[PDB]
Symmetry: D2
Subunit: 392 residues, 4 copies
């Protein structure tokens, strides 16, 4: 009943494993009906876990779906080729011309760009809010607000929402709004979005659930209210993921507890050490006091993953930036995160100000986003330490 | 320079094969930048075949993309999780509220349903045309017509468009329309859509390109005019396909010539034999005289694949339908087609009338859709022959 | 009916489970729901009940059923590559003091396994000319345990008179196990077990896979030999992974349309080469006049796309490079049986060193071709340009 | 630094090519752009230049580099499963007239390979008690070619005094090859090559893969033995597929966080069982009092999650079924080293039949547990309920 037991067993019914430990991998487009009667029975149950057509899924998808519903406490799981596909398509599934979308201004940039470049030309408007607005979100609601889009902690800058206050405020004014969250940082499990009255918990399963930086997949776990419309409207957009990726995602769940505990332990140690460092202005780790929304993190989360950022006292010029980033031995530059390896990315205040619509930034030094992987934490601190010496 | 040589070699540059015969399989979300300078160079070339992020693709995607552009004569290839995803997302990529979509009424049903259920609520209207309308398509154009959507031969009923006449008519009235085709029957190669002044040739690569009924993938090969907008707008919807599927698709190309010649030879023999059969009212095979648009097929296509249909003299009742379909030895019931195996599906006139908007059907008997696979053609004819005896 | 058999081979509902292709069951551990169930699996662990991944999953059982129906056998043993199937099939039947009799035209690693591994185990090997037929009795010892055939032969492509050899072997050493490396025929163009051969071995790597990207060996056995090969191979830990098994089953599906094209194209090239002024001889089983062509015509139901020819000259190293480095369509590589065309050269000296107890009978450079699925006239054009480089 | 090494092992840019993980290069044929290039690859075909798929691709070279750095070896030979690596590693070093000396606690198929395959090849095998240490000189013959260790032992979990055994072997038969099945330690909890062992073998199937869905064997060799094992294994056609190589490399990445959890959980279960009224003895290398625990504590840097214990009673078949059929979390299956927990029973008679030249010293039913990644208290609760079924 504990999470580690859940993780090992999630989705592993005999009807999916067929004698093996893991689900089978059923590769298929065509699924064969042995009779008119069977074909008619499959048609009736085509969105209900019966083999009907590859686009709806095979045993391998059904297994992952069951596992996701168990882990996040959902009525259904809808699958997508990547996180960005789960975001764009989850929002598209619930809107119509004349609707309003209200989204945190700390939302992953492609999530915002979907709203500003795709939704806008379909007669759907979007506005943005500061992630710490809490109960004052009422001020940003419109008569036509259909979706309220959360991301906690926020992309890059890591602000944690006061979800209880936000949800209560939204329900008080537009109770029939669809509230969605990009719950990728928490891996859907360190923060139980659906227990908080959120309708749809979306993940880039690409990150922690896969955990190895070698498959892409999006998930949206839905409450009972929202599942049908998300599923059927995403189907009309031909959204699916391949059977092999679904397998590898279920397989990822198996080590997610041991991995997250290590990401938590190590990232917190790095963040504490950064907080005491002379060259560091501020540390944005949700688990750390003085970080935005930390108190909501403590109250509402059961853990931390390994992604965070910190602000240098300096704003690095281009040469110092190259000097710092080019010469790391264990941290690599790359996008994505949630793998076994450590990563490093720089953002300048001007870059971040440009992706914070209807809001202001709160720092002026160069911002570094770290993913703390599974390497030895002291080796990692040594690498960060050598970096500091390169920009003193 | 012949198609078989093209097929063997398409996409197989050394930069993708790295010493092997086939492209490597590069599984990745994160792609690592070795320096700020490399990261900046990759950013600039991120839609241009340089490794940048898994969502844009890896070497394995780039190889398939190159192969598709070569085979269809396109400026670019955009990839999707399945055919239906390539259809919905190709159309979405070019529309805005207030636009009109004009689509053949013989379009695959999910293609129509995307228009009628998704587009309509985004302020985009759709109307339909008879596939043999040819130059008289002018009658259906509106000031706001943005897309004209073709499918030749048509789904199920197999009508071939007079593409030259349709294209010329559209260009005469709305020269800036986006003309698209679902070119899956031809596998993009028996009909060179882009040579015919079509802007986007879309395939369910799931069918012939894969050829084994075990992977799903959509492709849209674009002319230079349309590539950017399709690619960038599909990216904003997070559309991609996994590296393994891309590999398997490139691998499918290798035997597409030998497979199609066999599908052509065998299906034509079956269709000729059906045409002489007493229990058969009509045969809808594009390669066969008396079939709708056959003369356009002869003029414009370089071959036939293995999908066609025929109309029984009877309209089967439920019991005769079960008797017929339940008792085949080599034909199986399933959706999809374009694999190595033979398939059979029944449709009643009432079913087809319901998916032919703004048009009338032309038959009254039960319609049978056959996919002729790679089995021995005489074994296949024996199975069909036993079926006839079951419903005499 | 071969095309129909190929499409359906191994595709029982218990293996495909609603799909067209067999499922892919990746597993080491296989779970027993009860102690009874574990007893039942144990008693059936070599008889297609799930027991342990080393013995196989549904995916392996599917491929094994398919190979057995295609080659008309009692069982199909699986190996990580063709060379593993050859080495381990032979090992499974010998003991110290045995003798092995192998065609001198056998694939070199097959010969090497005998000369370098068996020899230190007290097993002797000697060799025969592939055209020996009934005169093979000459070479049969009272301790001859294995007679190992390869028809057509590696590189030089000589075809055995299998019926004559089998009759001779049975009359003198009935206890011998007769084996064939039947890869060139993809197991289906020559129905080895119907000719009285005990074990038909394939580098499934070749035409069965058909795409040059999976490695696997198979050994289809009659009922006389299946258990021994199966159990002794198992003691050596021989198996192949589930996904490779899947891909090999998948290969079968296009095997007919592929082999027909390899046949038609290779023979056209062969016929053109035979008439070429720069060509001494062509070694193609399907071509009239080739060594053993009479046996090919009688005993085979088709041809594949691998053959060789002898240049009138023996190329020197500069010529060799000018010829081979400058092809546009043919690539240099080992293996064959994929969709693409390949070229390799062997000098007569090289061949002389791998024909034990034999004598080479050509003096020009030998060129081995695999004719793939490219347009045949494009391929002839590429060879024509190669001839210009060496005139 | 093991966690850092695990994360990075084998991940050179030449293998990953811009990605985080190595590429997957599926290939049999590998193309030579020129005759020169083909010469160069040929001379380097065992030295990590692309030559033929049977020798490996980039993906195999990546895993081989990783195993070599993790176990401190000159080379890493790959096999389709652990049992293949054991059978073939031994074969690679013997000849007729040799003697093999193997722990009587060796995995049964390891013993069977010796008694059923080697014996008919003129190779003799005898066996020793795992706690023999320096007294192993007793068993060493002038023709002893292989000394084969397994520490901890299969099933009963006895830990060798490796330093004492190695010193004795070197003093008496310096030409002997000392081998270990080092799977329980995942190669990294016991640095076998640093103790003077020649070849460290793993069923990589176990902890390296870590998920019970890929099969593979590895044999990491010192410089003295690498070439022979490598070349002789190759003559047997031993290899593993590229995708399994990829997945094994991938396993390494979580190996540290996994092993630490298997250690912590298994030891807690062991400690609880040792104190249980229904339990006679617990066989866990990490538990004080277990056979060879002093050697585990001295020579190992950690523990994995596989161990066993002896019930006070010998269960009859009804009791066996009531105990084993009714678990909620532990499953019955062979293999171990995955994320899930497993249980198997062995009766003392069963064990007595696989301890050649040894004597069993327990009389109750022996229960082998693999402790996976589930919550340890859930697992203890499941065992507690099992005890209630048999009181
Ligand atoms: C909270 C969150 N939610 C969803 C996603 C998207 O997941 P996926 O599976 O689509 O990459 C992610 C993204 N991980 N990616 C990055 O940190 C890097 N992304 C970008 O720079 C980016 C920003 C905007 C457009 C594209 C990209 C691209 F580079 F292409 F990844 C995310 O962090
Ligand atoms: C011309 C054409 N174009 C695109 C597609 C879609 O490709 P994909 O890769 O998405 O299945 C296809 C479809 N192949 N599928 C069928 O013949 C069966 N499809 C349906 O019955 C169907 C109709 C409507 C909705 C779903 C389905 C579902 F069953 F789910 F396949 C097609 O024929
Ligand atoms: C009739 C026949 N039987 C078995 C095999 C071996 O099969 P596999 O799947 O092990 O490669 C094959 C071989 N494919 N190989 C070649 O054309 C060339 N191989 C060698 O000369 C060779 C022999 C020994 C070792 C390596 C090689 C290497 F060069 F790598 F190919 C074969 O032709
Ligand atoms: C120390 C050790 N060394 C090697 C192996 C074999 O590895 P692999 O990858 O070949 O399974 C293993 C084995 N895993 N197997 C088991 O716990 C049980 N296996 C057997 O008893 C057995 C022995 C011989 C043949 C089959 C089996 C089968 F039952 F199928 F598991 C091992 O424990």
């Amino acid at each position: 009943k504990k999470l580690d037991t859940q993780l090992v067993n999630a989705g592993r019914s005999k009807k999916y494993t067929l004698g093996a430990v893991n689900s089978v991998i059923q590769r298929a487009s065509s699924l064969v009906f042995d009779s008119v009667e069977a074909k008619k029975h499959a048609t009736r149950n085509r969105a209900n876990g019966e083999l009907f057509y590859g686009r709806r899924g095979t045993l391998t998808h059904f297994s992952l779906q069951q596992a996701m519903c168990e882990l996040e406490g959902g009525a259904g799981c809808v699958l997508f080729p990547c996180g960005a596909a789960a975001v764009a398509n989850s929002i598209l599934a619930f809107i119509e011309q004349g609707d309003h979308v209200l989204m945190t201004n700390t939302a992953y940039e492609p999530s915002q760009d979907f709203c500003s470049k795709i939704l806008s030309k379909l007669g759907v408007t979007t506005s943005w809010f500061d992630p710490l607005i809490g109960a004052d979100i009422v001020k940003h609601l419109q008569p036509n607000t259909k979706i309220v889009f959360l991301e906690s902690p926020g992309s890059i800058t890591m602000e944690v929402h006061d979800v209880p206050a936000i949800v209560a405020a939204v329900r008080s004014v537009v109770p029939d709004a669809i509230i969605m969250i990009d719950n990728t940082w928490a891996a859907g499990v360190l923060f139980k979005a659906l227990d908080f009255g959120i309708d749809v918990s979306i993940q880039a399963a690409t990150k922690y659930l896969v955990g190895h930086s070698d498959a892409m997949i999006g998930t949206a776990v839905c409450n009972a209210r929202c599942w049908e419309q998300l599923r059927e409207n995403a189907y009309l957009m031909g959204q699916m993921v391949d059977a092999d990726t679904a397998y590898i995602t279920s397989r990822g769940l198996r080590t997610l507890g041991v991995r997250l505990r290590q990401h938590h332990e190590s990232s917190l140690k790095v963040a504490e050490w950064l907080a005491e460092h002379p060259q560091v202005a501020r540390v944005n780790h949700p688990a750390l006091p003085g970080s935005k929304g930390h108190e909501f993190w403590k109250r509402d989360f059961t853990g931390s993953s390994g992604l965070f950022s910190f602000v240098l006292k300096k704003k690095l010029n281009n040469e110092e930036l190259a000097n710092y980033l080019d010469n790391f031995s264990l941290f690599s530059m790359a996008y994505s995160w949630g793998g076994y390896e450590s990563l490093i990315l720089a953002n300048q205040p001007e870059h971040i100000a440009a992706i914070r619509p209807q809001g202001e930034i709160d720092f002026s030094g160069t911002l570094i986003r770290l993913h703390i992987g599974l390497e030895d934490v002291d080796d990692l601190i040594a690498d960060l330490d050598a970096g500091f010496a390169r920009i003193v």
